[PDB]
Design an enzyme around this catalytic site. Sequence first.
Site, PDB file in Angstrom:
ATOM      1  N   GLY A 138      -0.163   5.689   3.496  1.00 16.55           N
ATOM      2  CA  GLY A 138      -0.764   6.887   4.142  1.00 16.55           C
ATOM      3  C   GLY A 138      -1.615   6.745   5.301  1.00 16.55           C
ATOM      4  N   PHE A 139      -2.667   5.655   5.272  1.00 18.34           N
ATOM      5  CA  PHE A 139      -3.630   5.302   6.251  1.00 18.34           C
ATOM      6  C   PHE A 139      -2.885   4.846   7.435  1.00 18.34           C
ATOM      7  N   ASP A 178      -8.155  -8.608   1.102  1.00 15.48           N
ATOM      8  CA  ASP A 178      -7.184  -8.507   2.260  1.00 15.48           C
ATOM      9  C   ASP A 178      -7.757  -8.221   3.506  1.00 15.48           C
ATOM     10  OD1 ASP A 178      -6.984  -5.636   1.765  1.00 15.48           O
ATOM     11  OD2 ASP A 178      -5.433  -6.013   3.375  1.00 15.48           O
ATOM     12  N   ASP A 183      -3.931   8.050  -1.604  1.00 19.45           N
ATOM     13  CA  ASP A 183      -5.086   8.752  -1.178  1.00 19.45           C
ATOM     14  C   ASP A 183      -5.250   9.613  -0.032  1.00 19.45           C
ATOM     15  OD1 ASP A 183      -5.143   6.635   0.345  1.00 19.45           O
ATOM     16  OD2 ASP A 183      -7.115   5.755  -0.042  1.00 19.45           O
ATOM     17  N   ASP A 212       0.845  -1.114  -0.155  1.00 20.75           N
ATOM     18  CA  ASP A 212      -0.027  -0.034   0.071  1.00 20.75           C
ATOM     19  C   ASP A 212       0.934   1.211   0.008  1.00 20.75           C
ATOM     20  OD1 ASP A 212       0.934  -0.432   2.554  1.00 20.75           O
ATOM     21  OD2 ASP A 212      -0.978  -0.670   3.380  1.00 20.75           O
ATOM     22  N   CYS A 246      -3.759 -28.958  12.112  1.00 20.52           N
ATOM     23  CA  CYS A 246      -4.817 -30.010  12.264  1.00 20.52           C
ATOM     24  C   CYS A 246      -4.268 -31.283  12.068  1.00 20.52           C
ATOM     25  CB  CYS A 246      -5.836 -29.862  11.199  1.00 20.52           C
ATOM     26  SG  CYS A 246      -6.907 -28.409  11.693  1.00 20.52           S
ATOM     27  N   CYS A 268      -4.297 -28.553   7.008  1.00 22.60           N
ATOM     28  CA  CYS A 268      -3.252 -27.767   7.518  1.00 22.60           C
ATOM     29  C   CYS A 268      -2.280 -28.325   8.450  1.00 22.60           C
ATOM     30  CB  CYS A 268      -3.780 -26.438   8.063  1.00 22.60           C
ATOM     31  SG  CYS A 268      -4.090 -26.389   9.583  1.00 22.60           S
ATOM     32  N   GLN A 303     -12.933   5.976  -3.603  1.00 23.43           N
ATOM     33  CA  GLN A 303     -13.411   6.712  -2.736  1.00 23.43           C
ATOM     34  C   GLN A 303     -14.711   6.793  -2.530  1.00 23.43           C
ATOM     35  OE1 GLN A 303     -10.704   7.470  -0.604  1.00 23.43           O
ATOM     36  NE2 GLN A 303      -9.327   6.267  -2.242  1.00 23.43           N
ATOM     37  N   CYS A 354      -9.537 -30.392   7.550  1.00 27.44           N
ATOM     38  CA  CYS A 354      -8.769 -29.378   7.195  1.00 27.44           C
ATOM     39  C   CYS A 354      -7.169 -30.082   7.197  1.00 27.44           C
ATOM     40  CB  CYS A 354      -8.660 -28.246   8.216  1.00 27.44           C
ATOM     41  SG  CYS A 354      -7.304 -26.794   7.956  1.00 27.44           S
ATOM     42  N   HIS A 396      -3.675 -22.313  10.677  1.00 27.28           N
ATOM     43  CA  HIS A 396      -4.892 -22.586  10.601  1.00 27.28           C
ATOM     44  C   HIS A 396      -5.870 -21.556   9.797  1.00 27.28           C
ATOM     45  CE1 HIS A 396      -8.862 -24.586  10.812  1.00 27.28           C
ATOM     46  NE2 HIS A 396      -9.294 -23.690  11.491  1.00 27.28           N
TER      47      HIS A 396
HETATM   48 ZN   LIG Z   1      -6.320 -26.584  10.224  1.00 27.64          ZN
END
Ligand SMILES: [Zn+2]
Lengths: 366, 370
Positions: free
Chosen positions: A80-81, A242, A125, A77, A285, A282, A165, A280, A311
């Site tokens: 600015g924010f 995001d 911005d 980015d 898990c 991952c 905006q 899952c 996870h």
């Molecule tokens: Zn998982």
Amino acid sequence: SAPRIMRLVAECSRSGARAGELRLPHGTVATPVFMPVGTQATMKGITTEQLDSLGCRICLGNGLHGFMNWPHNLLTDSGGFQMSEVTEEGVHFRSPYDGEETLLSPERSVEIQNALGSDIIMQLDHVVSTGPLVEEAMHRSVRWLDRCIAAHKHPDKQNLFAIIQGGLNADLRTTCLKEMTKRDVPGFAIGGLSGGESKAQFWKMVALSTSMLPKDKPRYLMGVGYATDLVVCVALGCDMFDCVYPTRTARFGSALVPTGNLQLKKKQYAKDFSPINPECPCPTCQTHSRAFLHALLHSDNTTALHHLTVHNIAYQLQLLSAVRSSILEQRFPDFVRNFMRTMYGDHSLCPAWAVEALASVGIMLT
Amino acid sequence: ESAPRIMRLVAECSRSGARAGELRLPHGTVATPVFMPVGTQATMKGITTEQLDSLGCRICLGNTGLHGFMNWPHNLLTDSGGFQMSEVTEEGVHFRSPYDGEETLLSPERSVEIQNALGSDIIMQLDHVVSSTVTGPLVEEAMHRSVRWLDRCIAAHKHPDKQNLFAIIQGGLNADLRTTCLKEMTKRDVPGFAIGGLSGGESKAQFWKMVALSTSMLPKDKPRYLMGVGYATDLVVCVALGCDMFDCVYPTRTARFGSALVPTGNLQLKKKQYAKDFSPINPECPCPTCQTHSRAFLHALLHSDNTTALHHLTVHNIAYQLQLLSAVRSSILEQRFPDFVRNFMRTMYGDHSLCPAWAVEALASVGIML
Ligand SMILES: [Zn+2]
Ligand SMILES: [Zn+2]
């Protein structure tokens, strides 16, 4: 017309859902895609290899590829924010070191992002915290966009995105949509829709933006990570997302599941010897039960945050992979019906804002 | 019947018991006195091997090969796993598994086998520790159980040339019990000795007296490892009593509370008085955080991006630990350790009247007057 970075692969016949891929310098990226915040994962002990294993091909950064040791794509980015008064010259603030007055101009923001070497870069911005100063910031954001475009001297190495905006003002966002669309930038982001209270106004502003953004260019929706939000916004025409939602959810000891989240600090998990999700794949898990994570959350909290974040990030990537597959399989309305059924139970119990939003694109739950 | 020694004494203080030496370990030498940070607590906070190596760290603690799992070119120390993972019998520690949730057993033989596979350079025996709330004759039975467990660890450890097994002195705050344990474990030929049961105690007066008791009976030519001690004043005093090695989660825990270790105590950076302080944590500290971050920046991060602030505070707090003991060690080599302590107490507390009474008495026992 300049070369396009997005290739449309499939579309939903009833709704606006799109499945495509982005051609970026560090590799292709399948869309729709959720992009985790790289530094939020790195500060919790998540490594490049772990993130690469989960299938992640793009994430957000604060060149930068070598500093992180990351072989895939990065999005940065303007800054600015995060980092005070704002004038037409740029953002005025006191440095976090020398403590002296500093200026971040549109030209300086582009120059910083050029040196980082990321694949997608965001314009600078002017965001405000009610009165007629909101419309003035919108017109300044358009003028700042043109200065960013002029200062960006590498359109074949980095992709500059504009930021729509207007907040929740339909008339203001319509003006910004009409004005920014006239610039030939490779992609467009939708700002000002994160963490809002009114879900009804949230989805109506997303639908307004996607109705006027180019079909052949990506739509990046900033600050959105809730599961139902992701599915609904894909049905409205968004391609990129995001949020710190997976990271924030792990800080509270919660694990993302198809029915919401598991509050693993609750005593009902102290003797639950199953994984977070038996389906899952991952790493968390494979090695950790709910009882173990419950025990770690009360003594070794820092270690539990690491495994919950692995996870929760994996859940995000799996969710949109399933979303994308249903689009390719030409069965996205049926996916949404099953997703809402599993998440909430029945059409009567779904949040009204999502039922109305999905109906706007012809996906009925009743 | 003595095995080769892993510690070389380089210098000693003429007034006190402070020692400066180096350990010969398979992954490189280690200058002592040394504070060993907990490696996994740093990795889970985004601290990498390269950052830790740059700070000068040559040995750290592992969870419990393991060198490759961490990507670490230097030395590692691993614990037995008892204090983490319920009933205890002579066979070992009985507990319910975290995975299958079924009854499991951690015996002295199994703990050594786990640590042998991890490949660390120093390994700790399995001991039987009871809570400080336990009082009666069950405390003495756990001490004698630890001695029998020590012999089983030695018999099960079949590689003294690759890994170094340390015994753990028991007894808690009972002077008579600890004397028995010291007398009994000293008869075993282990490369080093650790001092257990002295972490996080309330009574500072009994704490320093138990440390002195242990160092008076442990071998001079072998290291003294004091477990669970990381407070700055504790480290200096315990070095003066004859300790060589330390570990604690104190630097990591201090960062979770938004505090940065400084020579005058700590800076509570969550306080509003630092919101406009644009100086480093310490202008004399060469750590990365003090090169790039002001107090005002860290103050702002502690209220919005807390996870990022924990990373930079932990980098600094670990660096402070390593710098403190490096300065301690240098003063010993320079034959000026009493003068180092006097300046350290002056900076930390201000004046002899404001120093903690327990530290003044402990230092006086070894001839360091303030
Ligand atoms: Zn998982
Ligand atoms: Zn520092």
